[PDB]
Amino acid sequence: SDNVIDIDLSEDSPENYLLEHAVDGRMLFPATGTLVLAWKTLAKLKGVEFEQLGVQMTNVQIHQALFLNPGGKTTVSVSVMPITGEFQVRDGESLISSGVITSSEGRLLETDQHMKKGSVLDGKPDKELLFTKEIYREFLLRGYEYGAAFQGIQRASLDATDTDIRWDGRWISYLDTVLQMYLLSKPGTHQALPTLLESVTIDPRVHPAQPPEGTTEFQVLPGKWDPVLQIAAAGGVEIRSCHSIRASRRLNHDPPILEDFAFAPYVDPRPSDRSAAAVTPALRDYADACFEFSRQGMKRWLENDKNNVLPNKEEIKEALAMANKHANFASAKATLEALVNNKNGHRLPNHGLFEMLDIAFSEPLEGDYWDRLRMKLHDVRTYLWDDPIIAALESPDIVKLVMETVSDNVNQQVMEILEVGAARGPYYRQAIPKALEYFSIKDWQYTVADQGFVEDAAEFPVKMMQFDPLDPANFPAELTESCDLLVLKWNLQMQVDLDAAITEFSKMIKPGGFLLVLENGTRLSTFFPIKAIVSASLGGKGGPEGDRAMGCFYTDAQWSALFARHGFEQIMHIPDGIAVSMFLLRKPFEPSVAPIIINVDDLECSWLEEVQARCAELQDSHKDSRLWLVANTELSGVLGFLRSLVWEFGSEKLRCIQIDDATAGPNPPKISADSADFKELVRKDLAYNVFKNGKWGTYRGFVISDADRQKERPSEYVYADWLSAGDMSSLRWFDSPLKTGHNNGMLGSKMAHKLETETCSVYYAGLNLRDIILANGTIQRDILPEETFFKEGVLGVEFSGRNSSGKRVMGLCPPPALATTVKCPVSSLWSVPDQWTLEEAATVPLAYATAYYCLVSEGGVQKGATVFIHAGASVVGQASIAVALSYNCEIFTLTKNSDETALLKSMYPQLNDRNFCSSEDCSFEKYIRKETKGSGVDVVINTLRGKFLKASRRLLSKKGKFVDIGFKVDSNTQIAYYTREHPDLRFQLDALLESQGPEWTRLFDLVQAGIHSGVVKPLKRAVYSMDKIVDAFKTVEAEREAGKIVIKIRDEERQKVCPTPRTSFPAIHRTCFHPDKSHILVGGMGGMGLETAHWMVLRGAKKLILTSRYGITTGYQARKIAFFKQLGVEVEVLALSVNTRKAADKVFEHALKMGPVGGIFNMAMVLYNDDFLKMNREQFLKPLESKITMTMLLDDKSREKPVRDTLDHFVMFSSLIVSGGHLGQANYAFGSTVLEKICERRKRDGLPVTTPQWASIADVTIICRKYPQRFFNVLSVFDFMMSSDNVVTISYVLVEKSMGV
Ligand SMILES: NC(=O)c1ccc[n+]([C@@H]2O[C@H](COP(=O)([O-])OP(=O)(O)OC[C@H]3O[C@@H](n4cnc5c(N)ncnc54)[C@H](OP(=O)(O)O)[C@@H]3O)[C@@H](O)[C@H]2O)c1
């Protein structure tokens, strides 16, 4: 109604600096931006200029975020009430800001900061100051992305109390930079969204005037932060008591792609290898069931074919005959139907062969049968494509192994693929989404072809060609030297003349190209039923390799011999065993010049000179010349070294061979110049040859499914948390830090109260409405007592289990008590009487402890007093009635429906209908007022809100007490809590459980007395298992029926004092660090070193020894370490390099002095990026110290006592240069690969090891087409990396799934 403000976010608009304010990518209008709009509006109403008006905004509520849009116009309406000052910044019909704006002519500013002239941060060292780069690195790590316009704090002290704030004449920027001082005063990791600014005073009269026009250098105004009063004051501005709400950090990019950098054999993989077919025992049964169903179905087909309408009948007799050689229809369908309809967990994704076979046989034998059935099976063709038998060889691992192995060997930038016959047997639907969509460095061009248009390929980035696939000699001549890979899925089995087809197919292969063939090789009579009805000319000439089975099938052994006969080298061969087989072939390579071999075994790089010389003469030699970098040791970086060399010398000549001594079989290869094994390798001319586990293979990064990141495994200690805040359907069970004996969150205020705690094995956990309110996002974790801020979880307080002595106990503990083990203070533990089962005990503690607090501790109930209890059917309501009845009180209670009234009356026989009202209307006020003869109710236990809260205070007597325990308080109510106007009694039982002082021990004794006197009786309850935790929370939230919801953790033993059996629970991973052990962080005084150290501090670590070449040299390092120490962490910063045994000894002398060594981290990096041929040894061994010398001096020291037994984690950070390669970083690649080989040796010896292989990290742009990850997401995958069995995990984010060219 009042001023309408238009914000022009255009190319040259003066208010374009407002797009330089983003939170996790999204552009936002600053929270202190509606203050200026309200400020400018009030001055406009008064008719005065806004910079001559001194305003004061009080209790400014931020309800929404005004999302700015580039090149767009945002119109917001500001409405100010003339006399009272109530203002409203509202975009459209949605409120963005509310509060009260008041102008004045006197002095409004409280602090005297506007009088301060200079900057007190003068003459200080550079290690005692924070600069704009360091200040806004801390904000970026929390999601606050400020552009150059909003980077106002130009310098600050380590405490951030004193700052230099820039004045540029823009008031939205200046107010934001004065709120950044408050944000800079609350170090942490989460993103805090302001929600209430109690006071904001702007006095431009004492503020410096706008800088002259065209100013380039602006003045810095001193700023100060007052912790006593919580005032951020700079210049003529003052922000007081800003309240923020935790915000879930959203991911700017798409989820990272996690892979397992593992070794994969080429030919005939064993069942334990990753290139092997994924045939489970269940699949081998489905294959047999289909085989029996197919075999007998043909028998049924032959005998019933009395009309002779079954062409290929001789073929169906031959197929039936062979099945008999290698061997009722009702039973055959019975076995399959039992397999299909069973849901025993072991369940194939789908049963397509059975489904499509059933259509093949069940179809009647009559006129127009074959034409109709051929149409029917062409309508369910998808079943054959997507079938466990057919998908065993189309698994993501094999598809990626083939597609990337072929890419490592194609020496172009685009990789031309050609899938001939894409209508019958398709491969694009598997190659594209599983392997080719992950490509970042190489481009791919896919070309499907067939007789007709490929209907299913319309949605894929492929090119559809047209010609006859089933007939050679008509292949278009435009396909000569056309494709670097040829895929013939189910094509060579349809060719009448194989030699002619293969000869004509081999011409389409570029020199050095590959041919991929997938054909049936075993149990050839299983799929024949469908190749009988859905094939026209089932006749194919045989040859020297034998006679085609039926007329369209060769056996796997005959397939391999046939390919070998045409001079094809078997690069890879993966037999499914149950059905299909896969061959990858390329033509033999005959060198014209002798290959050059250089041994790169030495880790001191005594060959840098020779390789550099031979690498220089690459582009002046014959095209058939090759450099073979050979390593015969487990530790060698030849694999990642040759990837980086390929980036500047091409893939044409650079080849490599590694032989792993440790796992090389009894017959190790003998690669040495004119050897026998080498020549077999100079003929395949594969870039990377690795002999490990007894077979030649290659290192490939196998993608990890997003479902495996939340895979649940047995865990002795678990606790319930949420995967996503505010979602009650995301509740899971995570690993509990109690496996270390202690509980996360021992920092700050939790370090002051040294409560004596008894470790109890939880058997039942009661679900209260306090947990549902937190779980569903109605209230953030920050409203809870400050002692719970760093706790792993905040769900659950009450429980009933067994203490360490085996006694049955029940009690309330600080969260998480929705767990399997707790550390309950001895002053909060009651003993279960020997008449209650532990199930009944789980319902008593909180319900009655709250009831006594509300009635006898806060309400001061006296004998005979009148009490009004809202929601009498709730557990707290039932407890309140029982406590009140014991005090001989006149009870009035609000019951929703008649079922609740009946339940309460039966539960408490003293309750008559006169004692009951309805929670559906405020008609209880007249009834209660009349029934009390105008005296009112002495105590009101209020849960209902709005007009029921008002109508219930109105019933209070002269001395009556109002106990409001509802959770969903209004905004005005919360401000009353903040302003100390009213006490917040809804998280007081949680606060008394942190202090456990005089006020609690009064409630402990009141409840204990009630148990003895019989007042405290167990309530009716519903027991939910540990897997229905989500459903239990939903049951509590809905409040459809009265009762206590109690999660059953363990089964109570028949005895009464007996040790709890040790058991495991399925739970998601959650890495935790032992607080009594010392964790060494070599290079932990850096970007990821210090931000990872903070992550460990939250997850349990309390003893850090951080190592650097120089120690603390900046004010960001000194401010972080002063934050760990304040939290209660024993930090130690050593200015040494662990490059000699003396240095290694010192770092572990200091570690063992602090405590047993429980973790070693190596984040150290040194980089000299340069061209390989302009690098001497002194410059090639630069990155090799932090990665080859500090990793075997930390690995030698971790393999000796006492480190070996105590050590839990051995993390050696790596880079994707070992998996992708990079330009100029050929020395870093060698160091990063030898580091990964030391970590794989540790796994061989059973020692703990983790090797993160990160691409790029944002907070601590697009390189090789990969977006840098946000650190809050690097620590999310890092946590999964530590709690996993693989050694090397590759984490990288893709800008977008790769398309063609
Ligand atoms: N953040 C990224 O962009 C990114 C991307 C991919 C991978 N990574 C991985 O993460 C690490 C790099 O993280 P970052 O550079 O952001 O932070 P950082 O690892 O903490 O930084 C490297 C640190 O190494 C220390 N250092 C070097 N040589 C040392 C020696 N001989 N002894 C002890 N300390 C030594 C340096 O301490 P001084 O400075 O005091 O000498 C420096 O602070 C590497 O392991 C890398 O593989 C990071």
**CA-CA distance, 1299 to 437, in Å (whole number)?**
7
Q: How far is the CA of 1296 from the centre of ligand 1 (A)?
A: 29
**CA-CA distance, 993 to 976, in Å (whole number)?**
24
Q: How far is the CA of 1134 from the centre of ligand 1 (A)?
A: 15
Q: Which atom of ligand 1 is nearest to the CA of 1213?
A: 45
Q: Report which protein residue has its CA nearest ligand 1's atom 25.
A: 1083
Q: How far is the CA of 1132 from the centre of ligand 1 (A)?
A: 18
Specify the pairing of strand 580-586 against strand 569-575: antiparallel
Neighbours of 1037 (CB within 10 A): 17
DSSP 8-state class, residue 160: S
Q: 837-846 burial string, b = 16+ CB within 10 Å, else e?
A: ebbbbbbbbb
Token digits of residue 673: 């110049």
**CA-CA distance, 130 to 160, in Å (whole number)?**
8
Q: How far is the CA of 1086 from the centre of ligand 1 (A)?
A: 6
Q: 812-822 burial string, b = 16+ CB within 10 Å, else e?
A: bbbbbbbbbbb
Please check whether residue 176 is in contact with residue 30, taking contact to mean a CB–CB distance below 8 angstroms. Answer: yes
Q: How far is the CA of 1136 from the centre of ligand 1 (A)?
A: 14
State the DSSP string of 632-674: -SSS--HHHHHHHHHHHH-TTTEEEEEE-TTT--SS----SSS
Q: How far is the CA of 1082 from the centre of ligand 1 (A)?
A: 9
**CA-CA distance, 273 to 849, in Å (whole number)?**
59
- Picking from 1289, 1266, 1092, 1219, the residue whose alpha carbon sits closest to that of residue 254 is 1266
Beta-carbon contacts of residue 1029 (< 8 Å; ≥ 6 apart): 720, 731, 733, 818, 1047
Q: How far is the CA of 1213 from the centre of ligand 1 (A)?
A: 9
Q: Integer distance in angstroms from the first to the last C-alpha of the chain?
A: 55
**CA-CA distance, 817 to 824, in Å (whole number)?**
9
Can you say how many angstroms the Cα of residue 1185 is from the centroid of all Cα atoms in its chain? Answer: 33
Q: 109-121 burial string, b = 16+ CB within 10 Å, else e?
A: bebebbebeebeb
State the DSSP string of 594-612: PPEEEE---SS-TTHHHHH
Token digits of residue 242: 């800003």
Beta-carbon contacts of residue 83 (< 8 Å; ≥ 6 apart): none
Q: Which atom of ligand 1 is nearest to the CA of 1090?
A: 20
**CA-CA distance, 262 to 698, in Å (whole number)?**
8
Cis? peptide before 714, omega within 30° of 0: no
- Picking from 1181, 1271, 1171, the residue whose alpha carbon sits closest to that of residue 1224 is 1171
**CA-CA distance, 1021 to 767, in Å (whole number)?**
10
- Picking from 339, 360, 362, 361, the residue whose alpha carbon sits closest to that of residue 350 is 339
Q: Report which protein residue has its CA nearest ligand 1's atom 28.
A: 1164
Strand partners, 1067: 713
Q: Report which protein residue has its CA nearest ligand 1's atom 32.
A: 1137
Token digits of residue 546: 């034998």
Please check whether residue 1093 is in contact with residue 1081, taking contact to mean a CB–CB distance below 8 angstroms. Answer: yes
Beta-carbon contacts of residue 1211 (< 8 Å; ≥ 6 apart): 1159, 1160, 1161, 1162, 1250, 1251, 1252, 1282
Chain breaks in the chain (C to N over 2.5 A) after: 327, 1260
Instruction: Name the strand (E) or helix (H) holding 615.
Output: helix 608-616
- Picking from 429, 430, 431, the residue whose alpha carbon sits closest to that of residue 417 is 431
Q: How far is the CA of 1163 from the centre of ligand 1 (A)?
A: 5
What Cα–Cα distance (Å) separates residue 317 from each residue in 37, 309, 823?
A: 88, 14, 74
Neighbours of 451 (CB within 10 A): 13
Q: Which of 1082, 1095, 1108, 1185 to mutate to test the pocket of ligand 1 (most atoms within 8 A of CB)?
A: 1108
**CA-CA distance, 834 to 1181, in Å (whole number)?**
73
Residue 1254, phi then psi, degrees to nearest 5: -80, 145
- Picking from 457, 439, 433, 434, the residue whose alpha carbon sits closest to that of residue 447 is 457
Token digits of residue 881: 């009635």
Q: How far is the CA of 837 from the centre of ligand 1 (A)?
A: 57
Q: What's 1216-1254 look like in SS3? A: HHHCCCCCCCHHHHHHHHHHHHHHHHHHHCCCCCEEEEE
Q: How far is the CA of 1284 from the centre of ligand 1 (A)?
A: 24
- Picking from 1287, 1207, 1290, the residue whose alpha carbon sits closest to that of residue 1249 is 1287
Q: Which atom of ligand 1 is nearest to the CA of 1138?
A: 32
Residue 72, phi then psi, degrees to nearest 5: -130, 165
Please check whether residue 1189 is in contact with residue 1139, taking contact to mean a CB–CB distance below 8 angstroms. Answer: yes
Token digits of residue 260: 């397992």
- Identify the residues whose C-beta falls under 6 Å from ligand 1: 1082-1083, 1085-1089, 1107-1110, 1137-1139, 1163-1166, 1185-1186, 1190, 1213-1215, 1254, 1256-1257, 1260
Specify the pairing of strand 231-234 against strand 956-964: unpaired
Q: Which atom of ligand 1 is nearest to the CA of 1137?
A: 32
**CA-CA distance, 128 to 130, in Å (whole number)?**
7
DSSP 8-state class, residue 478: G
Q: Which atom of ligand 1 is nearest to the CA of 1113?
A: 40
Token digits of residue 702: 């196998």
Specify the pairing of strand 144-146 against strand 21-23: antiparallel
Rg of the chain taking only CA atoms, in angstroms: 37
**CA-CA distance, 32 to 51, in Å (whole number)?**
16
Q: Which atom of ligand 1 is nearest to the CA of 1215?
A: 47
